[PDB]
Amino acid sequence: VPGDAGFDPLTISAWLDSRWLREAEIKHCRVAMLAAAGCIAQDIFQFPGAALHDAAVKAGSMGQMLFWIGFVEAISTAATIQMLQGGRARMELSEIKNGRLAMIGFSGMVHHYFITGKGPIELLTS
Amino acid sequence: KKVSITVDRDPVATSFEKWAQPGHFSRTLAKGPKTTTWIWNLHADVHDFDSHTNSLEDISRKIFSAHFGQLSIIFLWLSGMYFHGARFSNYSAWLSNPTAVKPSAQVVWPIVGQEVLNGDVGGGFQGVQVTSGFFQIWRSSGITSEVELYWCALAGLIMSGLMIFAGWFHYHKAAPKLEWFQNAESMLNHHLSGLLGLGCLSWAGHQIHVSLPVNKLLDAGVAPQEIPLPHEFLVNRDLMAQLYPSFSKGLVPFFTLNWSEYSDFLTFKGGLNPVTGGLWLSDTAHHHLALAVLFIVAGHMYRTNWGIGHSMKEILEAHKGPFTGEGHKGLYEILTTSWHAQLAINLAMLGSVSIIVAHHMYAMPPYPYIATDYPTQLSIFTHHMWIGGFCVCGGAAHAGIFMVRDYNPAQNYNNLLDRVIRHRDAIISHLNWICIFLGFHSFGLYIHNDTMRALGRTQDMFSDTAIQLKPVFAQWVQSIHTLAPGNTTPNALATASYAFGGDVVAVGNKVAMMPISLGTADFMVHHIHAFTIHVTVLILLKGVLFSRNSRLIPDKANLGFRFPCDGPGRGGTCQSSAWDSVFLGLFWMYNCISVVIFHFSWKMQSDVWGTVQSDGTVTHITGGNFAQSAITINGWLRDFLWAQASQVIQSYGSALSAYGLIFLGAHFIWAFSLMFLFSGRGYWQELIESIVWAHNKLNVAPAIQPRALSITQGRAVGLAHYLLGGIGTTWAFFLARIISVG
Amino acid sequence: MDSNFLKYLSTAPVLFTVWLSFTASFIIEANRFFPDMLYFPM
Amino acid sequence: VPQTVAWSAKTGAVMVLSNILCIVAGRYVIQVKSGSFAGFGLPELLASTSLGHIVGSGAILGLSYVGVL
Amino acid sequence: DFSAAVPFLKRPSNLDGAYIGDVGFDPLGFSDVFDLRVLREAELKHGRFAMLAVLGFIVQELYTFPFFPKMAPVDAHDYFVKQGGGSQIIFWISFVELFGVVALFETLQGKREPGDFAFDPLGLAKDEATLERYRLAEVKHARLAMIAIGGFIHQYWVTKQTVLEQLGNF
């Protein structure tokens, strides 16, 4: 229901379950918002002692993170299967709109790094 | 969405009560034994589900869970093969010297002197030499250590536990409904796309990322413990681009359709790898990728839930012409309501595929160092020929069970089955004539040659040095296949197989493969093959076509698929059932497959296998005697059976003495079978009467009254011990011979 | 223990397989500790 | 080895042509389903464009093989 | 209905509070497929072994009997395996486990609680209320200890330091 603009040219809603689609969109929105905030913040400041994916995997940070995220996702998969079997509203609309916005902005930031090898905020400053 | 998942929850209660009640599954057997026949009848009919239950739903549920039980057994078997390779094998020593060490993964305990079976297989190891070709599989996979073999064994155990759990769950907790099983379009889409297509694609991915780098390093000569672990190829893309520089470009050439970038590791070489004598693994990787692509494409043909696709019923009903009446109408209903019809088709195809596997794996050796391991080549050819022959005869067994039981004339009016049954005399008389013509002009050539050679007339023989029967069509096909590289397969570099012609491939001075020339002896034994196959088809087809009725017995379907006779009248109707044509056709399958494996063994020893001495000359195991000695029966008796049984009969006191004992034991079991085959039930019941009298005299008669075996069971026991003895005698003869000399 | 599982273990094939495996097994053990007894030692 | 080419707008042209060709063919030959505005849905579009990528991949590779590119 | 422990997940339907320590946490759903009595006995047995083991690891570093040579506890296993002392411990554990099989049958019949071996030598549990507190506590200590076991066995593998020394160090 939140984030409804009646936008379905390809009419995907009819041929796939709405609960899975909306849950998938909200999960993508959350991941994107976190990633875009992380990309700007990380340029602002560095965590102590710490393309970046490669350094991280060599460091081993990604592998431990993958195990803990995977555990949350495995517990979550039971929940998503259960859903498939069977002013707060304004906050939901803000959550979906900001997430969609990040899903566009973050994609831009990563592709910007391909072209210029720069972080998004520094690129503008330089 | 008429293709949907539908399940009954908690259908059957997981109880031990019926375990304690043998025979619970049928109304006849559930009331307990009164004669010993009950015991045999219990085992004979137990997996005959459609004989216990009327409903297709319960039958389908039983079949699905029993297939999970079979998978659990196969996974346990594979896990044990990996564990015995990991723990009780010389695999690590064999990796260093594949041409010197003999594979061995079975060690015996010392009890009654049986530790003589732990022969010196090489690599500081003692054990029973194994011929299943697992070592070459593991080297092709890129295993390189016993630790990875322990992890494969654990993966097999986990899969075995999951399959036995799935069989229990899907019979006792969540059993699908009949409408789930009757989804032939969905099942074919998933089994082409999902099972076969993603099976090939995932294996191609493993070959590319693990098998290719590890085996390139092995064939370069790097020691196995010096080779990087398989995941360092996955991560360090630079290390992979060292061996295969195309990896420097990643997956952009795949997606942009610039596929000729990948020619480093996706080749079309053909021929064999000179170092290992096996197929180029870059070719197998490209082969599995291409097979994956068109299995995933083929699994999109049939219609499931969105309007795109074919209806298999419409395809079948549309193919009808002027000779064949209503055509394929009603075949969809047959194949979606009868499990026996499906099993008849799938068993005939699986048996044919196993026979093709036997030919293709000796001629185009796929694994590294399997071509010069002659015990493995002979073992896997012989093994897959026997699996093929058995499965083909079970295809005709279940075609007969369908015709007797699941066939309904009302739903099969004027279609292809109705018309076959309505001219079965023309089919069986023409097949009968062909089998007579083809036995006279194939085996009669052998008898003509025995007579001429015995009479001193060698100019009157069918031979290369006399009247010649050359296989010109087979020779011409061999010519075309040697001319194909650069001509009709222009981008291939070598021939598909050196059996067609070309070079001699030698690995460790032993021939991997070399051209298999065809002469008069090859013409004769190929027509022997066509004769034995045509006769086996005659017996099995006559059983299927006359399963319901004959001119002899007009109501054979009321007696069933398996009945012994319909009395001594009409002159005698012994062995008139469809079961008795499967019984008689398994003898002729045995005859056919025995001649095929003898032809392979003698021809490969005489004309292919052996050692390459200096100057490129090849010394074969039996020195090229096939050409001038496989044209007479005396030649097969003397130069093949008599000459090559030397190793089994001289094996006593060595590590091959087990084969000498099994040679004799199988001769025994084979002869013992003739007691059941040449005899009749009435004699044995009258003998049992006097034995019962002696028990009554001592007051020790049993309450389960002893009976002679049924007529059908006397036939089944005779056939089982006949096949066990004959195959066992050949198994021992083949293995001791080729282990000693090859 | 379940009485129906024990009634299953009392069936003829289970008892036959267990009894002849136990029998074969003490023949094997007796020939491990006391091998090559061609004669009763006397 | 058959000669393939790095992706250019010509490769794109072939792909686009094949996809559109199959979209129109699918409007004509798909037996179970405003020439393109009647009964046109996602499975029809996804099937005609899947056949477009199969026909287009074959056409691109063949035209690269013979020299048309 | 929803599980108390995790709000988004649903209450399993076999976890109705029948057994102490139930918070509704069963995402995989094994409780539905299998008898819960077996699982509760297994949970107590695994936990009791783990609780003893974590104490044993710590104590062995703190104090060791003089006759046996002092060794790292993780690697002590191998020395006892060859010595025969480890075999003696297994044999006695197996002997008690044999009686445990009979007790498992008693549980299935309904004559026994899942983890009740009637062990009250010191009579710590005076009344039902203190026993209830203890059984919930035992469940929590068992669960936490199962996590804690392998907590520093795995740490030992990454860093060759005694857990007590490791705790102080770095």
Ligand code: CLA
């Ligand atoms: C599935 C195929 C398979 C096959 C054919 C074999 C065959 C063999 N294995 Mg291997 N093994 C396998 C899988 C397999 N194994 C797997 C999966 C593992 C991993 C766990 C192993 C691990 C393994 C080890 C570790 C060893 C063997 C050994 C052996 C050998 C002797 C076994 C023996 O006599 O013990 C007999 C043992 C008994 C306890 C006798 C039991 C007899 C009972 C009565 C059989 C009854 C079945 C029962 C009645 C079924 C009904 C149940 C009931 C409820 C009614 C023999 C070559 C030994 C070897 O090679 O030593 C050099 C050895 O030490 N195996």
Ligand code: CLA
């Ligand atoms: C992609 C879907 C898919 C796949 C892979 C299979 C696979 C199989 N089916 Mg089929 N099946 C499917 C869909 C599928 N089915 C559908 C949709 C239906 C309903 C119409 C059926 C109905 C059906 C029946 C009625 C029967 C089968 C049977 C079988 C087995 C055939 C014997 C064989 O080759 O197993 C050996 C080959 C293997 C590869 C063993 C694999 C074991 C697992 C189950 C395969 C899949 C694992 C997983 C997806 C892979 C994860 C990859 C991950 C590591 C990345 C095989 C496991 C028969 C059987 O044996 O039942 C048990 C049988 O009787 N299936």
Ligand code: CLA
């Ligand atoms: C998609 C999200 C994402 C990903 C994959 C990464 C991944 C990484 N970051 Mg970036 N980062 C992120 C978000 C992300 N970060 C955010 C949101 C911030 C702002 C706080 C930062 C700020 C940041 C800095 C300043 C630095 C990194 C660094 C790193 C690397 C080392 C791991 C680390 O210390 O991260 C730690 C990141 C965090 C603690 C932020 C976590 C914030 C979210 C909310 C965590 C939620 C966890 C929670 C328990 C899950 C809830 C589940 C749900 C059911 C409710 C690694 C490549 C370091 C590096 O190697 O760069 C050189 C480094 O110096 N990141």
Ligand code: CLA
């Ligand atoms: C009683 C049945 C039986 C037994 C005991 C064996 C035993 C053996 N087989 Mg054989 N096999 C059988 C039936 C049997 N086979 C049948 C019916 C077929 C025809 C499909 C084959 C085809 C076959 C092949 C192609 C190969 C073996 C190999 C082997 C050996 C290694 C086993 C292994 O790990 O497989 C390992 C198998 C592989 C690594 C590759 C298998 C690739 C095939 C194409 C997989 C197909 C699976 C698919 C679901 C089947 C579809 C059938 C089709 C009609 C639809 C061993 C001697 C292997 C061998 O000779 O090694 C020296 C080998 O390469 N078997």
Ligand code: CLA
């Ligand atoms: C996928 C394969 C497959 C499947 C599922 C079936 C399934 C079935 N068949 Mg078919 N069949 C098959 C293959 C198959 N068969 C093949 C390959 C042949 C050719 C031989 C036949 C020939 C055949 C006939 C002729 C008949 C069946 C019958 C049956 C049904 C009853 C099974 C039963 O209760 O036997 C119970 C199982 C046994 C009694 C096992 C004993 C069999 C042998 C003698 C033991 C094996 C010896 C062993 C391997 C080696 C011993 C080692 C030694 C040294 C000690 C059942 C529907 C019967 C029926 O009436 O169907 C309606 C029937 O009459 N089948």
Ligand code: KC2
């Ligand atoms: C494909 C994913 C992608 C997304 C979704 C995306 C979204 C946004 C948004 C959305 C909120 C803004 C406001 C934004 C801003 C700019 N982008 Mg970015 N952008 C993406 C990728 C690329 C590429 C491939 C290029 C590029 C460019 C520019 C330039 C001009 C600079 C110039 O013309 O040189 C500006 C102002 C170029 C470049 O990176 O130059 C450094 C160029 O080639 N972007 N971009």
Ligand SMILES: CC1=C(C#C/C(C)=C/C=C/C(C)=C/C=C/C=C(C)/C=C/C=C(\C)C#CC2=C(C)C[C@@H](O)CC2(C)C)C(C)(C)C[C@H](O)C1
């Ligand atoms: C029942 C019965 C009786 C009895 C009895 C007995 C023998 C009772 C014994 C009970 C015991 C031993 C309980 C121990 C629980 C241990 C836990 C919960 C683990 C905590 C560790 C944590 C949280 C950690 C950690 C960490 C990790 C992993 C690694 C480190 O780097 C870091 C860190 C240290 C933080 C008696 C006979 C008295 C009578 C009575 O009538 C009935």
Ligand SMILES: CC1=C(C/C=C(\C)CCC[C@H](C)CCC[C@H](C)CCCC(C)C)C(=O)c2ccccc2C1=O
């Ligand atoms: C010997 C013989 C018998 C009698 C055979 C009997 C009674 C079988 C003897 C079995 C005894 C009772 C047990 C011995 C079984 C073996 C030790 C191993 C059997 C292995 C499987 C049975 C499990 C017939 O009934 C018969 C009927 C029709 C044609 C030919 C014959 C025939 O030749």
